[PDB]
């Protein structure tokens, strides 16, 4: 049993303000531009998550790759993801996936890593809609 995850990548726009967007609503981006040709790797982080849910902060170390994708013309990619997977003990668990932009990571329009805890609320068309946010900042330490 899988869900159909539709990812849409919109570039930063000074006039749209980046509130959260639920997985069961279509958001047109409010004029911001879809970003084409952005490569994402989707890691199955179910094991890393279930090692300790209360401590999970987005690590995908040693996580297997669930899928890769590249945004199209409309800034979108679609991927069916299993709603359950296995933890490190081999026990069946609700699945968690980490979306990581590998390319082009264009500065302030780089997507922040985000993770997704299935099953999610689906829209009427049956899709799960995610909208990666741009990174909080372009300076870093540590
Ligand atoms: Na696809």
Numbering used by the authors: 39 to 180
The authors write:
Two immunoglobulin (Ig)-like subdomains comprise GG-SpaA, each having the conserved residues of a canonical E-box motif and internal isopeptide bonds formed between either lysine and asparagine or lysine and aspartate residues. Our findings show that the GG-SpaA structure has certain features in common with other pathogen-derived pilin-proteins, such as the Ig-like CnaB-type folds and the presence of internal isopeptide bonds6940.
Here, the crystal structure of the N-domain exhibited a major conformational change at the domain interface region, but with the overall fold still retained (RMSD of 1 Å). However, isopeptide bonding between Lys47 and Asn172 was no longer visible in the structure. Upon further inspection of the structure, residues (170–180) encompassing the domain linker region exhibit a 34 Å movement towards the AB loop. This structural rearrangement has caused Asn172 to shift 3.5 Å away from its normal WT position, which subsequently prevents isopeptide bond formation. Moreover, the NH group of the Lys47 side chain shows a ∼160° rotation toward Glu139 and forms a salt bridge. The localized perturbations caused by the displacement of the linker region has disrupted its hydrogen-bonding interactions with the neighboring AB and EF loops, thereby moving each of them away (5 and 7 Å, respectively) from the linker residues. From the structure it appears that the C-terminal tail of GG-SpaA (β-strand G) must be properly positioned to create a favorable molecular environment that then facilitates isopeptide bonding in the N-domain.
